[PDB]
Amino acid sequence: GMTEYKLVVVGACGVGKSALTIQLIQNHFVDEYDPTIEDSYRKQVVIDGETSLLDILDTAGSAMRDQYMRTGEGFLLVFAINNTKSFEDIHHYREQIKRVKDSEDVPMVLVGNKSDLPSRTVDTKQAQDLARSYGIPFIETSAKTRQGVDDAFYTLVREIRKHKEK
Ligand SMILES: *CCC(=O)N1C[C@H](C)N(c2nc(=O)n3c4nc(c(Cl)cc24)-c2c(F)ccc(F)c2OCCOc2ccnc(C(C)C)c2-3)C[C@H]1C
Ligand SMILES: Nc1nc2c(ncn2[C@@H]2O[C@H](COP(=O)(O)OP(=O)(O)O)[C@@H](O)[C@H]2O)c(=O)[nH]1
Ligand SMILES: [Mg+2]
Q1: What CATH number does the domain containing 152 carry?
Q2: Counted domains in the chain
Q3: Ligand 1: which atom is nearest the Cα of residue 92?
Q4: In the record, which positions carry N-acetylmethionine?
């Protein structure tokens, strides 16, 4: 087979995990996607002259979750820039990933979503300071304008390649 990448999208309720995933896959913005629907999605992509399948768990609400945490190769830590609590929660999501990998050394990208909204309560400097503390990239996205969406997923792929031979 071609190269596959197993990605897991995590973060608090309502930050835009499903909307970011739908935008990557369907190039459209969903206003209301059932918050309860946990599913995996696939997408063939070319990234730096390599054809690959992305296998993406969009977390919601489990032997599948268990298996994706055990075998997932990289994580998007998603918060919304107009949701301070969601940003504060990132710590707890990173800690759950570290438990499961028994490791500090896990490919991750910090994603600040809803960049299109004016009610921004998490500044870029807070986000950049947290990503720096974690040793990981920070990418601002809007699932609505699609800004940063490819960037976030491609950067995670590249972080996986930096960590391991594919
Ligand atoms: C709209 C509802 C919604 O999207 N969410 C977000 C998320 C799916 N969620 C949730 N809740 C929760 O209490 N914790 C989660 N932990 C994980 C995920 Cl995928 C989702 C949630 C999780 C990891 F991110 C990584 C490894 C892992 F094992 C894991 O699950 C552990 C069990 O859940 C725990 C355990 C400890 N803390 C937390 C929170 C981070 C505080 C979770 C449901 C809902 C809010
Ligand atoms: N304006 C705006 N709204 C968004 C964005 N991303 C998600 N939303 C909205 O925020 C709500 C929660 O999004 P959803 O993707 O379901 O959150 P999830 O619980 O993380 O999957 C929905 O009503 C989305 O339309 C964004 O980038 N911009
Ligand atoms: Mg969702």
Answers
A1: 3.40.50.300
A2: 1
A3: 40
A4: 2
